[PDB]
């Protein structure tokens, strides 16, 4: 795997509010069955399964968090 | 060769008298059965009379307007077909038989 998921979550926690909203947006767009994603839009929570996330969206999120944390 | 020139004008030839006769008969019905002493009766009667009067006036007006637009677009298309034929005469060389 070309991504360290624990440090990725660390950078996710570092991201600001709008960066999190954007993560939500891109995941809701690229939600596929092999991934395990849940979104309570009524109340407004969002949970993603990193282990099921494929390497594509993983590296995409990695580039995103690099750009928005450094 | 030609066609029944009424068929292109179904709207104003047919559906103008259709709705006209209809609204006229309707106004006739309301007035004929306007119970004279009935206060709300005659109120509604007079109001709907004015209503259907505005309606028929606006219907004949709107058909006038649509026929005006149709006349304009018709003569425009007349000059346009003039253009088209005048042009298309030249390309007979390129276009096949």
């Amino acid at each position: 795997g070309s991504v360290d998921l624990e440090k990725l979550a660390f950078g996710l926690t570092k991201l600001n509010e709008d960066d999190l909203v954007g993560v939500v947006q891109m995941v809701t767009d690229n939600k596929t069955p092999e991934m395990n994603v849940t979104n309570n839009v009524e109340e407004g929570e969002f949970i993603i399964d990193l282990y099921s996330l494929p390497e594509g969206l993983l590296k995409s999120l990695w580039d995103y968090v690099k750009k928005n944390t450094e | 060769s030609d066609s029944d020139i009424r068929y292109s004008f179904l709207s104003t030839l047919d559906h103008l008298p259709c709705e006209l006769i209809r609204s006229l008969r309707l106004m006739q019905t309301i007035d004929l059965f306007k119970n004279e002493e009935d206060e709300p009766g005659m109120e509604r009667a007079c109001r709907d009379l004015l209503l259907v009067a505005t309606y028929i006036n606006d219907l004949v007006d709107d058909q006038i307007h649509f026929l005006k637009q149709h006349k304009k677009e018709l003569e425009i298309q007349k000059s346009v077909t003039k253009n088209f034929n005048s042009s298309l005469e030249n390309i007979k060389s390129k276009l096949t038989l």
């Binding site: 979550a9 996710l12 926690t13 509010e17 709008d18 999190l20 909203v21 954007g22 939500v24 947006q25 891109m26 809701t28 767009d29 690229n30 596929t32 069955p33 092999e34 839009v41 009524e42 407004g44 929570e45 969002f46 949970i47 993603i48 399964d49 990193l50 282990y51 494929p54 594509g56 969206l57 995409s60 580039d63 995103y64 | 179904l10 709207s11 047919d14 559906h15 008298p17 259709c18 006769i21 209809r22 609204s23 006229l24 008969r25 309707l26 006739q28 019905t29 004929l32 059965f33 709907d48 309606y55 346009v80 253009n83 088209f84 005048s86 042009s87 298309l88 390309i91 390129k94 276009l95």
Partner: protein, 533 residues
């Protein structure tokens, strides 16, 4: 607080849904995320309809992109070169001046196409979260292009699970959600498109004249080809709630009556218009020999628990009474529609019988009690609207129509069939089932309307292959054409006859007094209880 991560590598987040859906923020962040799209992001599930569209456009402009299944074949004719006459006579010659029909400065270039596709791809991350994603959801429980992917429908404010897949254009159906404007009936995918369309459709009313307005309910008698687009939109919405409304495109004839729940909103100090929320409709043919007064009906699921269905059938029958013609709904019928018509015919026959009872009891003291009356199928039909077949089929469900076992046809004076009211209590309760319902009833005075007097066209702007006078006029006037007269000239002078009268209350009083004056029957001819079943 706002975010957390469990040890199983699941990231719980919290965001405000309004900020999430805000269009300007959404499209800005979409252009932000735009390049970050990994073209190798997997597609092992539902292939995006928007992505299908954009890949079609790419392979159309021949920008080689085969990251997905395959490109499609039919895109053009091989002779797009300088041989097509259209390149030497542009616009059919509609433009004269060269400085006006030239296009060297507007024929789009490769760079401009790339710019357009770039905006498109910056939008891709914005469309799925705008159209395909919902604003609210509750999905209770107990390749993917052949059937639909439509999942909701948004009218004025609600979402709707569509009971049946409608034949929308693929552009709309392969989406997940679809908004449909309540007034204009335009169907668009993106909630952004709906936002602008709601900003633009200031014609807060549906089209067509208005023939009924009581309180909040109202009807609109939208003609069939004075506005054909609106009607096609309405039909394409209706197919989402009728199983057998197949006549949804060629709607020139059908005179769509459309029910609506008017609302007076003055929340803003400027706007006060009567918002005419479309509720229900019933397409009725314009000329039908088979005696149909309601071809296809529906009220929307969002407006149930209000009896608008029964109201709309009652209005169809009020219309038939006003036309003084006999009609029944189209025989190939909804299984649910079959039961609701069972109920409605039962209730209507019970109501007519109750009117007969109350009138006879107005005439109770003066008329001898042993004298019985003789009502007829037509006597009931001129009162209700249903054909006599319908009346008997809605009376047998009421179980008040009894017959005689044996046939002593030697004497024609003998009674064959009878109406034998078992219990006025039974009938009054069968009718009172509506009283406790408090359903909207057709206040028969508010209707302002007249029959649809056809000319030679029958209403359509064309010709179709399909009483007898006009039905033969159509076929006679049909004559071949490639790419004896003067009907209706006398419909105004049809008042001089008294056989057919104008108003429904006049027809009712007429038939009621006619039967009151019909010869009576003593209670003694058939008082044998066994002989009546």
């Amino acid at each position: 607080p706002n975010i957390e991560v469990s040890e199983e590598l699941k990231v719980r987040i919290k965001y405000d849904s309004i900020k999430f859906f805000n269009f300007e923020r959404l499209i800005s962040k979409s252009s932000v995320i735009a390049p970050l799209v990994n073209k190798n992001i997997t597609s092992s599930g539902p292939l995006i309809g928007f992505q299908r569209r954009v890949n079609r456009l790419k392979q159309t402009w021949d920008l080689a992109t085969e990251n997905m299944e395959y490109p499609y074949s039919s895109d053009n004719t091989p002779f797009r070169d300088n041989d097509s006459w259209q390149w030497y006579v542009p616009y059919g010659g509609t433009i004269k001046k060269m400085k006006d029909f030239s296009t060297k400065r507007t024929l789009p270039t490769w760079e401009d196409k790339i710019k357009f596709l770039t905006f498109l791809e910056n939008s891709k991350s914005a469309t799925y979260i705008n159209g395909n994603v919902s604003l609210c959801n509750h999905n209770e429980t107990d390749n993917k292009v052949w059937f639909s992917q439509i999942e909701y429908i948004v009218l004025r404010n609600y979402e709707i699970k569509p009971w049946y897949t409608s034949p929308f254009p693929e552009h709309i159906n392969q989406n997940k959600m679809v908004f449909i404007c309540e007034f204009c009936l335009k169907y668009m995918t993106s909630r952004y498109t709906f936002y602008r369309h709601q900003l633009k459709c200031l014609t807060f009313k549906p089209p067509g004249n208005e023939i009924y307005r009581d309180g909040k309910l109202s009807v609109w008698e939208i003609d069939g080809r004075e506005n054909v687009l609106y009607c096609q939109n309405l039909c394409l919405l209706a197919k989402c709630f009728i199983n057998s409304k197949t006549l949804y495109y060629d709607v020139e004839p059908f005179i769509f009556y459309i029910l609506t729940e008017r609302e007076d909103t003055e929340n803003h100090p400027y706007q006060n218009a009567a918002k005419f929320h479309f509720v229900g409709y019933f397409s009725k043919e314009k000329f039908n020999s088979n005696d149909y007064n309601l071809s296809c009906i529906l009220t929307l699921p969002i407006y149930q628990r209000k009896g608008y269905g029964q109201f709309l059938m009652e209005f169809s029958y009020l219309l038939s009474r006003k036309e003084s013609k006999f009609g029944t709904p189209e025989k190939p019928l909804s299984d649910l529609g079959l039961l609701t018509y069972r109920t409605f015919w039962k209730i209507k026959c019970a109501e007519v019988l109750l009117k007969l009872r109350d009138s006879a009891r107005r005439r109770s003291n003066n008329k001898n009690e042993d004298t019985f009356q003789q009502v007829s199928l037509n006597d009931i039909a001129k009162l209700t609207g249903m054909i006599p077949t319908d009346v008997v089929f809605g009376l047998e469900q009421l179980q008040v129509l009894y017959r005689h076992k044996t046939r002593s046809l030697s004497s024609l004076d003998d009674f064959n069939y009878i109406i034998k009211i078992d219990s006025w209590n039974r009938i009054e309760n069968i009718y009172k089932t509506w009283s406790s319902k408090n359903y909207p009833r057709v206040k028969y005075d508010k209707l302002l309307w007249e029959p649809i007097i056809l000319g030679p066209s029958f209403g359509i702007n064309g010709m179709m292959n399909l009483e007898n006078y006009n039905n033969s006029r159509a076929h006679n006037k049909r004559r071949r054409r490639r790419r004896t007269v003067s009907s209706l000239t006398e419909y105004m002078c049809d008042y001089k006859n008294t056989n057919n009268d104008r108003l429904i209350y006049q027809a009712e009083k007429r038939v009621l007094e006619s039967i009151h004056d019909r010869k009576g029957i003593p209670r003694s001819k058939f008082s044998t209880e066994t002989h009546w079943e």
